Amino acid sequence: VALALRHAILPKRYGSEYKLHCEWGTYGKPEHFYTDGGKDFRSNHLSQIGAQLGFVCHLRDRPSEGGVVERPFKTLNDQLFST
DNA sequence: CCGACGACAGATAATTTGTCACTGTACAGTAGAATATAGATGCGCATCTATATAGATGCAAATTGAGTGGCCTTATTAAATGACTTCTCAACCAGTCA
């Protein structure tokens, strides 16, 4: 989770061996971070990251509330990985 | 004259393609993993074997010292040297003489 956070927050660079034709020009710091109840997220380490970055950790009430995280995963099975 | 079939042209739904709106369903930590077997290979330990004896013994020459057995001219004389044996070893009285 700490590694996913820094890759999300920082400006992104990829070399030509990725053959990208548009830029992932996406960066900057969240105000809030919303998650399932896994021990990665409900942890002192993410609490300390959140307090130092100033973002608030929030808990997902059901799997069916977080479809914005979950649904990237079916699309990738259907558009990428099954092929 | 009446009926049937082919040429050419004309109109038409089936077929295929495209577009558009509504929808069932997967995203939700998760099958590489557990549990037998045979079959080959390697290290360890025991259980023999075959060689290698030097010490002891028996025996058979090879002298070696120590025995034993068999074969031989003689009688007189003389001298020389070395020995043995035997015998003997009185003392004063009586008759002359310068």
Resolution to one decimal, Å: 3.0
**Geometric angle at alpha carbon A7, from A73 and A83, rounded to 5°:** 30
Strand B neighbors by CB, 7 A: A 36, 38, 63-64, 66-67, 70-71, 73-74, 77
Q: Which nucleotide has the least CA–C1' distance to A37? A: B29
| A16 CA → B1 C1’, Å | 93
- Computed from CA positions of residues A2, A27, A24, A59, in that sequence, does the dihedral angle turn out positive or negative? positive
Residues A30, A4 contacting (CB under 8 angstroms): no
Residues A39, A13 contacting (CB under 8 angstroms): no
Residues A12, A24 contacting (CB under 8 angstroms): yes
User: How was this model experimentally determined?
Assistant: cryo-EM
CA A6/CA A47 separation, integer angstroms: 15
